[PDB]
Design a protein around this ligand. Sequence first.
Ligand SMILES: N=C(N)c1cc(-c2cccc(NC(=O)C3(Oc4ccc(Cl)cc4)CCNCC3)c2)cs1
Ligand SMILES: N=C(N)c1cc(-c2cccc(NC(=O)C3(Oc4ccc(Cl)cc4)CCNCC3)c2)cs1
Ligand SMILES: [Mg+2]
Ligand SMILES: [Mg+2]
Ligand SMILES: [Mg+2]
Ligand SMILES: [Mg+2]
Ligand SMILES: [Mg+2]
Ligand SMILES: [Mg+2]
Lengths: 5, 5, 236, 236
Amino acid sequence: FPATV
Amino acid sequence: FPATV
Amino acid sequence: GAMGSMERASLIQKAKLAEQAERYEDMAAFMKGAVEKGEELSCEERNLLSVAYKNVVGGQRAAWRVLSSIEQKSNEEGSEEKGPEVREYREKVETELQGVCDTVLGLLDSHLIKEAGDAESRVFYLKMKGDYYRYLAEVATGDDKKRIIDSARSAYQEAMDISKKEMPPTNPIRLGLALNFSVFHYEIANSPEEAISLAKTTFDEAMADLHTLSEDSYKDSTLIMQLLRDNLTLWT
Amino acid sequence: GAMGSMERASLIQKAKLAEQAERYEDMAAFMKGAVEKGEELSCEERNLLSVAYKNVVGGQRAAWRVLSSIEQKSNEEGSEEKGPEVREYREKVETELQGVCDTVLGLLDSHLIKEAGDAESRVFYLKMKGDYYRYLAEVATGDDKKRIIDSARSAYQEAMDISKKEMPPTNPIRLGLALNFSVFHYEIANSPEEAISLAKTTFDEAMADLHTLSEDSYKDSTLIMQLLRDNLTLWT
Ligand SMILES: N=C(N)c1cc(-c2cccc(NC(=O)C3(Oc4ccc(Cl)cc4)CCNCC3)c2)cs1
Ligand SMILES: N=C(N)c1cc(-c2cccc(NC(=O)C3(Oc4ccc(Cl)cc4)CCNCC3)c2)cs1
Ligand SMILES: [Mg+2]
Ligand SMILES: [Mg+2]
Ligand SMILES: [Mg+2]
Ligand SMILES: [Mg+2]
Ligand SMILES: [Mg+2]
Ligand SMILES: [Mg+2]
């Protein structure tokens, strides 16, 4: 999964 | 802390 | 409101204690109680709110993905019928996830966003609104899926428009908004080219503004820039 | 019983799904529902029950320790009075921990232990009874602390007596009972010499019986033996 903040 | 199971 | 009898300052203190104890459900309940006192949130308080709910919903999303993967396998050709239990439990976790998202969206609508006038608060809350609609979109499969996607897109777009007018390109909230809107494009809106374009433009514009920053601000901005690059590496 | 309308087999299936999803509170609720169907538990089901509650209570114990450490610091000479919040929240976590322990002890008393006749089930349940009294003892500070300690000791001792008569020295339940009773002696009963003696005698007796085991049983037994040695290294 891609990075989110 | 010591090991418990 | 079970927290209505506790002082606002005590709720914030307990949220911080709950964080240290890794009790994120408690943390979120304390911060919901603080929001429901009706006063605007300071910067630190907004981040306490977001940390708490991000951890709660993040665990629920991880569980939903595990269950959804098991369920899709039970539906392959040649799998042994197991009855309704996998679907039922996936649905249970899904409904609890939706409830958390509706709670957060409710706090933003009553009345955090309408009272947020400074860009740092308004962009932060609109980013959160996009994020929680995005989590709803991840599990949506019905008549409302397109509308949930458009609600996420609309919140992110309003946040983007404000951020581009009112914040420098290195502002970590602006960077994190772009990171997450880029993920929305890639994973939700079936727009990988838009996701890649947004991540790369955001990174390059931030690079060119790093020279204006102190050492501490530089660390903050380059941390989020590295996430943009990480996603670009995953996608290209 | 919120689980009273669900089939026993569906509760067990969902407990397994909850484990895979790392939803241990759900896992424990499903296993409590299965126990409350009134039938004895198989080996696998007993381990599902213990895994679920061990994870739930383990998280609560970790949080209680963090909060207790903060609280003791707020009580040092030269600390700034913060009001009641640290104590109140430590108490909240403590009360929830006590409730989980009382739930487990209640299941063992109604009616898992009284129906357990085989050594593998009876020793397992009595070990659990000692463990959950031990967790109660960890937070006890009042008129009942000595009685809670003696309840843990009594359960562990009955389990030990059965295990020595009915199980080989390499049986992993026997080994894990001894490991945990040794920890009780060291950390709860202020008897480090008894803790060390028990761990060393258990290890040496198991060593001498390893030759009777298959490769898979040998792996199971030596894993727990290594924990005994780890504790002995910590304590000597
Ligand atoms: N946790 C607590 N008790 C407290 C946390 C804060 C606080 C205040 C401002 C910024 C941060 N920044 C972040 O948490 C991270 O960055 C971002 C970057 C962008 C965004 Cl929109 C959100 C977060 C998260 C991802 N990794 C780098 C830091 C925290 C105050 S109190
Ligand atoms: N989790 C699941 N779905 C399932 C787990 C089991 C099962 C059945 C018998 C034994 C184990 N053994 C253990 O979990 C460990 O050993 C011990 C050793 C002694 C004790 Cl009294 C408890 C546990 C724990 C510590 N590390 C080594 C293994 C598991 C069946 S189903
Ligand atoms: Mg007040
Ligand atoms: Mg649904
Ligand atoms: Mg654009
Ligand atoms: Mg039935
Ligand atoms: Mg108390
Ligand atoms: Mg003895």
